[PDB]
Design a protein around this ligand. Structure first.
Ligand SMILES: NC(=O)N[C@@H](CC(=O)O)C(=O)O
Ligand SMILES: NC(=O)N[C@@H](CC(=O)O)C(=O)O
Ligand SMILES: [Zn+2]
Ligand SMILES: [Zn+2]
Ligand SMILES: [Zn+2]
Ligand SMILES: [Zn+2]
Lengths: 364, 364
């Protein structure tokens, strides 16, 4: 007996195209998404070139329209030069991404004043998300309050961070957050097995106490999002390992295992992988779209999942219970039992759909 | 013709006793203060032992009462273990000091949650000051807002920081700040002369643009304070140079030079070295206390000033116009033309004066 889920949404993926296509491309990364029960992804802007201006966004849009197998929206990235220049294209993006800690030069912001300038100039009705670790969470929350708007905190990984966000929510501040599966299912304890190269990720893996705190504070977590960050094994095991884990193909099986164990409910999962992503990012429904999962099937995560070009996974050896059996995307069978059945280019930019535009008040 | 000033107050000094008396002690550091026209100092808690508990404060109080030549108040320091334990002694301190960036282990706070705990537990009517650089200024401001109270930012050194504070003040937030003379009168340009050991200080020396921004934003600066941070030349020039500059003996001559040049007014100076320190820290008046200065005398700062045991200065070679000629403290001549004339122990703890207690509402 299969369970029917709505089309799940991952608001934080790195698909590497343009410029990093040996790591992943739109076609491979969206195959990975479909195999993970994900029918819509929001792609981060730290590509080569980075998506920090209109011409780069135009290029990325065409590459995505040609290569994506599931639907998508593309983030713009904040830079030290582009505040006040993105107004004409802002509404066509998923949102604006700020990289506020070490950054996998072009996206480096060297001053909180630059953060303020982005918060002041980016249209008020459109999303802003931040890579903001530890005290940086408090700092960006202060900027959001000074500019009287909301912010979404990416990949929360620490007890410190989730408790700060909890305190902010208790004061009625408009902040939301997401947590990635590696910060719920891996910890420092796993670094011996992973080794120092594979284990590199930002935010870094937390202590057992960090992991426990995220679970205890599930009510504070608005979304799950993979931070799918593919790099090849050669890169991860080489002399300067880049940070990041692939995660699209493993996220849902890990979380379904947790549901089966009673660690959270099926509804808790669907709020965090469907309803809250929709409402925070103003993402439209996908007609005739659903995912069928098998909750009884037990399996062990192998050394690499079938689709991501990363060709490795930090979850290797973990036992899971839960499998994606079939995905239907806009009336077509997109995935069945390991076979992707929609071609590159089937996916569409949801921000171009009438229902995918973010509502705003009219010029004065 | 001499100009009579009120007794000036330095709210940020390191007097090194207990435990670092080769660098400075209460007797030498307060001689330095008097020679700099300063009649009251607030001493930071990063001594050995650090002033982080009642027994350490009791020791420091007696050492100060026995050694100080000018009046004083002693800060308590926040630690990872002492939130909620300082209530009985809090009112006897200058305030609570938080070290939020690298810290010249016992005072290290590893989580913003620990900052919140201090803001929640320290009595609401008493001062909190923070060493908070760059984004840490925004972060501690967020904690202050979440806990609905004020904060004072120590040694503001950067354009980024003063503009963030300016924005916070424009939003009516209760934040005040101080600036040290090295951040107004030295910059990166001076590092070639100083060398990498002598030049070490936290916050580090800023760019010319940082210095210019502090002057342009003088209206945002509530206090001047030396951050007198004495270390011997051997230490500064050795294999692991500690950060910090001595500054009590040079602060007023540098600032009087600026007054003479029309860079700020005499009143601007007295707001920042007298009235605003009094009002932010609730420090009492000193009866029969004043400073006589000569604004015409030109001199060049030598390789060391007479009193600080640091026995070096980063301002060596700078030409100044302005000299402290006489200081009277509570009716006694304390300093004349290079001679200190009050003994160790003349100084008193102002928090023990009836007028030096901070007013508060009565237990419910
Ligand atoms: N998280 C990572 O470790 N790496 C991400 C960057 C990011 O999400 O910050 C990547 O793009 O490789
Ligand atoms: N500022 C410094 O460079 N050093 C100070 C510490 C401080 O004020 O942060 C010291 O005590 O030596
Ligand atoms: Zn990130
Ligand atoms: Zn990311
Ligand atoms: Zn400091
Ligand atoms: Zn200091």
């Amino acid at each position: 007996k299969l369970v029917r889920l709505p089309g799940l949404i991952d608001v934080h993926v790195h698909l590497r195209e343009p410029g990093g296509t040996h790591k992943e491309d739109f076609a491979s990364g969206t195959a990975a998404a479909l195999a993970g029960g994900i029918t819509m992804v929001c792609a981060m802007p730290n590509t080569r070139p980075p998506i920090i201006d209109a011409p780069a966004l135009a290029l990325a849009q065409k590459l995505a329209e040609a290569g994506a197998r599931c639907d998508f929206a593309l983030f713009l990235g904040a830079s030290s030069e582009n505040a006040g220049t993105l107004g004409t294209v802002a509404g066509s993006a998923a949102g604006l991404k700020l990289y506020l800690n070490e950054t996998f030069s072009e996206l480096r912001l060297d001053s909180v004043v630059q953060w303020m300038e982005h918060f002041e100039t980016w249209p008020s009705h459109l999303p802003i998300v931040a890579h903001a670790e530890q005290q940086t969470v408090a700092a960006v929350l202060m900027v959001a309050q000074l500019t009287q708007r909301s912010v979404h905190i990416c990949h929360v990984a620490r007890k410190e961070e989730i408790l700060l966000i909890k305190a902010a929510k208790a004061r009625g501040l408009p902040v939301t957050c997401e947590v990635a599966p590696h910060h719920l299912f891996l910890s420092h304890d796993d670094l011996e097995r992973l080794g120092p190269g594979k284990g590199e990720v930002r935010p870094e893996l937390g202590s057992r106490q960090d992991v426990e705190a995220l679970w205890e504070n599930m009510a504070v977590i608005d979304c799950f999002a993979s931070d799918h960050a593919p790099h090849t094994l050669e890169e991860k095991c080489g002399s300067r390992p880049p940070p990041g884990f692939p995660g699209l193909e493993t996220m849902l099986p890990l979380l379904l295992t947790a549901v089966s164990e009673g660690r959270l409910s099926l509804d808790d999962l669907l709020q965090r992988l469907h309803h809250n992503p929709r409402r925070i990012f103003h993402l439209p429904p996908q007609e005739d779209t659903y995912v069928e999962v098998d909750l009884e099937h037990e399996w062990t995560i192998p050394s690499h999942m079938p689709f991501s070009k990363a060709h490795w996974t930090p979850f290797e050896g973990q036992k899971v219970k839960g499998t994606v059996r079939r995905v239907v995307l806009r009336g077509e069978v997109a995935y069945i039992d390991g076979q992707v059945l929609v071609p590159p280019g089937y996916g569409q930019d949801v921000r171009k759909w009438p229902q995918g535009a973010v509502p705003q008040l009219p010029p004065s």
